[PDB]
Structures are given as structure tokens and as C-alpha cells.
């Protein structure tokens, strides 16, 4: 939770990091998305690619990004510490992120958070001793109508109950990969119990098109 770096044996400038040959090809595509003379715009995508390859960002990964893009290392450090999706410490294989902002709180995200802690035997901010799970609270994840919800790595699990999340964790332990999305009965953001709109077949090309086009 700190924003200063202290070198340890496992996180120092000589900790091994380098992009794989495939990831170097992907970097060229990232950098080519921006005008020439403004390579620094690639710091965010490239820094995230380093985390995806490595799981987290040691100081050596941040230094490598600075070198590739020819930006001062401090400017990479500033980005790494500003945006919360960057892990400057190792995280469990499954980063469980529970939304606890008011819309999810109003629909009992506390029960979801308590259910996870009881099952995994850990508190918020901790990693399990097996290093498979890390748990944290996050702010609104943009799925408020599907509250309460969690994000585990790249996926959303929605309309959770204490029973649903415990099943999702059991699948993760088993090595299966649960399907994302609502766990309540509906498919996405439609009202439960029946569509109140979009029931009719949509109009085809040219419907209602003004004259003159």
C-alpha cells in the first residue's frame, strides 16, 4: 500500500525481466498506434502487457518499459503508482475484486465479501498461503445494475449470492473456469421476470430513413 520502493532480494533492479519474442511483436503494434514523436503514449498498454506476461510489475519490469520507449524511468514509476490495476507486488493466481461502492453496497455486497473471507480464510488485502487467491475491495466496476458483483482477473461475476460466489471459488480451486456473467437467471442487464422493451423484432435496413439521403 506504500508508494515508495525499497529494494528487496526478490524485487530490485537486477530482478530478471524481459519481454518474450511474441510480446515484442505485440509492442510494435502498440507503439504504432500513436503519432511519431509521441512514443510515450504507449507506456500504459506496454506496462500492462508486462504485468500480463509476468503477473505483476517488479521495479525491473518498470525499468525495461522505460528503456524500450525511451522515457525517463520516473515517468513510468508515476504511471505504475497512479493507476490501481497495476500490481507492484505479486498477487495470487486469482485476483478477486469485490465492488463495495454504494450501488453494490445497497444490494448486499457485504454478504459477498464476508462469504469469500469465510471460505478462503483470509481478510481483505491478503493472499492465501497457497498463493491462489488475493482479495481486495474496489470501487464501482461499471456493472451496477448487476450488483452485487466481483471481478476475478479479467471476468465479471454478477448478481451474486453467498452461494454463487462460493461455487465460483470451488470451480477455481478445481481448475475449472466458471462462465462469467449473471448468476441469477438473466443473461445481462435486462429486467428479471420479462423484457419490458425490445420485445418486437427490430426493423431492418432503411427503416425510417429520411428523404434526401
Amino acid at each position: 500500500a506504500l508508494f515508495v520502493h525499497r529494494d528487496t532480494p526478490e524485487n530490485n533492479p537486477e530482478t530478471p525481466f524481459d519481454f518474450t519474442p511474441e510480446n515484442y511483436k505485440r509492442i510494435e503494434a502498440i507503439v504504432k498506434n500513436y503519432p511519431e514523436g509521441h512514443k510515450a503514449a504507449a507506456v500504459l498498454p506496454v506496462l500492462d502487457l508486462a504485468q500480463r506476461q509476468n503477473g505483476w510489475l517488479p521495479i525491473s519490469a518498470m525499468n525495461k518499459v522505460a528503456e524500450i520507449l525511451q522515457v525517463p524511468p520516473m515517468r513510468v514509476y508515476e504511471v505504475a503508482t497512479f493507476y490501481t490495476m497495476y500490481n507492484r507486488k505479486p498477487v495470487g493466481k486469482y485476483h478477486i475484486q469485490v465492488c463495495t461502492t454504494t450501488p453494490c453496497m445497497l444490494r448486499n455486497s457485504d454478504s459477498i465479501l464476508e462469504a469469500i473471507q469465510k471460505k478462503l480464510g483470509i481478510k481483505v488485502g491478503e493472499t492465501t498461503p497457497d498463493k491462489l487467491f488475493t482479495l481486495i475491495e474496489v470501487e464501482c466496476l461499471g456493472a451496477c445494475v448487476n450488483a452485487p458483483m466481483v471481478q476475478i482477473n479479467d471476468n465479471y461475476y454478477e448478481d451474486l449470492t453467498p452461494k454463487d460466489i462460493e461455487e465460483i471459488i470451488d470451480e477455481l480451486k478445481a481448475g475449472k473456469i466458471p462462465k462469467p456473467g449473471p448468476r441469477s437467471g438473466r443473461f445481462s442487464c435486462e429486467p428479471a421476470g420479462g423484457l419490458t422493451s425490445l420485445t418486437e423484432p427490430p426493423k431492418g435496413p432503411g427503416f425510417g430513413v429520411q428523404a434526401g439521403l
Binding site: N33, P35, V79, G142, A143, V145, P191
Partner: protein
């Protein structure tokens, strides 16, 4: 003129795959009218396109509600050597707001076409779609759609056979609500901390990479092709004057069926909740307060919600705002002070820290609110907290500071007896 608004017919809805029950890919999109006669729209020219958006009365759907036609016309000027860019704000970070998420993943081609048509009106060479990093699957869906548009010749070199070149890049964020603010979004694209810029300069003069830019919300951009196809006069036929069009609403909190739904502008708040969201949990009489347009808008109590309309002017007259039209509903079992206190905690975690009144003031307000939740305070501190909020409001670089102060002002305005009651209880229990 209409007296009442609502009951939008399916034939008049713009986001016809809102729930993802039809193919979101190009074939499904075209069968639903997307990418139809885009060439003819492009060959009409930027002035014709800008006229249609002006006539439609469309206003920004990102929260501030600026008249879109006028805003996009800032780009309609001769080039000076620099490229020009459209930046689509898909950061969708306001608590309660999840409308843009459904557009991106279920109707991606509406957004892509909107970039081309919207970018054409500004004379932009490319669109940078900034999507919050947490929306990974939605970003991948959009990337698949963009590849389909490229492969079909609908964008890129000679887009839609129109002789206009246009690219559409997707850049992901890395976890910051402040990156939805238009200038902080630009800074993030440039590889810096998402810290908003002062104005002037304005983005239309100096924006992303220092070039003329327009930042537009996903919903604003995604409705532009339809407005051009069906005309601005069709769009302006919905809602009150200066409150035109349809609107995506998110209804969450203490309702029976929390959902996203498209509905006419100026629909009554009560009808929206009861007709689409299945009513307040425990009945309308169980309603306590509603946040009508995302966490940044002041709450309104049940008495105001009886008759208020959901449009820009009606909610302003009710001392709040339409915002993103994210309706958060709280029934009478809610601890209203805790609910608002949690929102100030959110703003404390999202403040970029750049400027003094929000770096220090929001954190200060957060500490007072936490004491107010427990009642561990004196009533004289309520007026003090009101004054602190007014010292943040209007004195910061960006509107996040305004957005943290307004919810506090809403709580004090309508629930001061509740705050004083909590303090009186604490004093006795701790006497």
C-alpha cells in the same frame, strides 16, 4: 406539443440489441440497420452532419449535458498542419452508471459507425476509443467489431468507398475514475498520470498529442449515425424542448428488477422506476431517496420524486442533475448517512490529488462524514461541513471536486434532522 413523455415504442429505440439477444457482430448489426447508407452520409459533408446533430437537440450523455451540435462544431475549422482526433470516452466510471458497457459489447458497430460519422463531421483522421481497463471482455468485443469493419472496408482507407480515410484505435485504461474527465482522459492517452488540464486551452484547439481533439461519450457518438439517417427532427420529437431524444437509464439499488433500459427523455421518475424496474422494493411508500444521475448528483427525497421528470432542466429545478441518468434507489431501510459517506469515500479514492481543494478537502469531508455516520460530532459541524463543500465547489481544476461536494450538499439539504438525530443518540450513549 406533448404534455407527457415516456412509453417509447420499440420501433423508436436506437439501441435495439441493448440486451444482447441478437447477434452483436457485423451481420447482425447490418440486419438491424447499422452501416446503412453511411457513404451517403459521409458524402453529405461535415456541415450537413453538424446541422443534423444541431437540429436533433442532442446533448452530451457523459454527465455534463453540453449541446452536442455546438460542441462538435468547434472542430469545423480549417486545418493548420496538425492532425485532428476524435476521442470516445468509454471510461464509464460513475457509480451507478453501466449504460456505456452495454453499448460497447452488444452494439459495438453502432459505436464504430458513430466514430466514422462523428469523426467525419470534425474532419478527424482517427478515433481513439478510451475504455476502462476493467472492461476487458467488452474491449475485446469492440476490437473484434473494428476488425470486421476494417475487413469490410467500412473504415480505414477509403471508408465506405467515400474517399475519406479514418482509423479507429482502442486504448485501455488502467484503473482510475478520474480518467473519464475529458482532459485527464487525454493525458492518460499520452502516457501520463490521469490529471486533468486547466482550460484554456480547450481540447478543440490543443488536445491529445497537442492537436485539435473532441472528447465524446459513447452514447453521444453511438446515436449520431441514426440521427443522420432518420434526421434530427425525428430525434427532437422526443422529450421536452432543449431536452430532446431518447436516453439510456440505469436503475439500481432498492428496486425489484434493477435493469438498463432505453426510454424517452422527460419521462417521470416514478413511471420509469415502476414501469421498467418493477417498482421500489417494498412499494413506492417504502422509498426514501433517489440519486437520479449517478453518484455526482445530489439525492432527492421521496416527496420530490413523486412528480419530477428525468431531463436536464427538470432535475436542475429540483436542485440536482440528470448526470449520466443512473438512477440509484434507496428504500427506507437504508442508512442514508452511510450510503452518502461511502460515496465520499469513493471520491477520496479517485481524486487525482493534483489541486489543493480536492486533494485536501475531499479527504477532510471523508473524515467528517465517517464521524457523522457514528454521530460522533456536534451539530455545529453540519454547517461547517456545508461551508467546506462550498470551498471545494468551483475552486478546483476539474469537476470531480464539484462531484464530491454535491452529494454532501444533498444529504445536508434534505436529511439534516437525521444527522442531528444521530449526534443526539451518540451524546447520550457516551455521556
Amino acid at each position: 406539443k406533448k404534455t407527457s413523455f415516456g412509453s417509447l415504442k420499440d420501433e423508436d429505440r436506437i439501441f435495439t440489441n441493448l440486451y444482447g439477444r441478437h447477434d452483436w457482430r457485423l451481420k447482425g448489426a447490418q440486419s438491424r440497420g447499422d452501416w446503412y447508407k453511411t457513404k451517403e452520409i459521409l458524402l453529405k459533408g461535415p456541415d450537413w452532419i453538424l446541422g443534423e446533430v444541431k437540429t436533433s437537440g442532442l446533448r452530451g450523455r457523459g454527465g455534463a449535458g453540453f449541446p452536442t451540435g455546438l460542441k462538435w462544431s468547434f472542430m469545423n475549422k480549417p486545418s493548420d498542419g496538425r492532425p485532428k482526433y476524435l476521442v470516445v470516452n468509454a471510461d464509464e466510471g460513475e457509480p451507478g452508471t453501466c449504460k456505456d458497457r452495454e453499448i460497447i459489447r452488444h452494439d459495438p458497430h453502432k459505436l464504430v459507425e458513430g466514430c466514422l460519422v462523428g469523426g467525419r463531421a470534425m474532419g478527424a483522421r482517427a478515433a481513439y476509443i478510451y475504455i476502462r481497463g476493467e472492461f476487458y471482455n467488452e474491449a475485446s468485443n469492440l476490437q473484434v467489431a473494428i476488425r470486421e469493419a476494417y475487413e469490410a472496408g467500412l473504415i480505414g482507407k477509403n471508408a465506405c468507398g467515400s474517399g475519406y480515410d479514418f482509423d479507429v484505435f482502442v486504448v485501455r485504461g488502467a484503473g482510475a475514475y478520474i480518467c473519464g474527465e475529458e482532459t485527464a482522459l487525454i493525458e492518460s492517452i499520452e502516457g501520463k498520470q490521469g490529471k486533468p488540464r486547466l482550460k484554456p486551452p480547450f481540447p478543440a484547439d490543443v488536445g491529445v498529442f497537442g492537436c485539435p481533439t473532441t472528447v465524446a461519450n459513447v452514447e453521444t457518438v453511438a446515436v449520431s449515425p441514426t440521427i443522420c439517417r432518420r434526421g434530427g427532427a425525428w430525434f427532437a420529437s422526443f422529450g421536452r424542448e432543449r431536452n430532446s431524444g431518447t436516453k439510456l437509464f440505469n436503475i439500481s439499488g432498492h428496486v425489484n428488477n434493477p435493469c438498463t433500459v432505453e426510454e424517452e427523455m422527460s419521462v417521470p421518475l416514478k413511471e420509469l422506476i415502476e414501469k421498467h424496474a418493477g417498482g421500489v422494493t417494498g412499494g413506492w411508500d417504502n422509498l426514501l431517496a433517489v440519486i437520479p444521475g449517478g453518484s455526482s448528483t445530489p439525492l432527492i427525497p421521496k416527496s420530490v420524486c413523486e412528480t419530477v421528470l428525468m431531463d436536464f432542466d427538470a432535475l436542475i429545478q429540483a436542485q440536482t442533475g440528470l448526470g449520466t441518468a443512473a438512477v440509484i434507489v434507496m428504500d427506507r431501510s437504508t442508512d442514508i448517512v452511510k450510503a452518502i459517506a461511502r460515496l465520499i469515500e469513493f471520491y477520496k479514492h479517485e481524486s487525482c490529488g493534483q489541486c489543493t481543494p480536492c486533494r485536501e478537502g475531499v479527504d477532510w469531508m471523508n473524515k467528517v462524514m465517517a464521524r457523522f455516520v457514528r454521530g460522533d460530532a456536534r451539530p455545529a459541524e453540519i454547517d461547517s461541513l456545508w461551508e467546506i463543500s462550498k470551498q471545494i465547489e468551483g475552486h478546483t481544476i476539474c469537476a470531480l471536486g464539484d462531484g464530491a461536494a454535491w452529494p454532501v450538499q444533498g444529504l445536508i439539504r434534505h436529511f439534516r434532522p437525521e444527522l442531528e438525530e444521530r449526534m443526539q443518540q451518540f451524546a447520550q450513549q457516551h455521556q
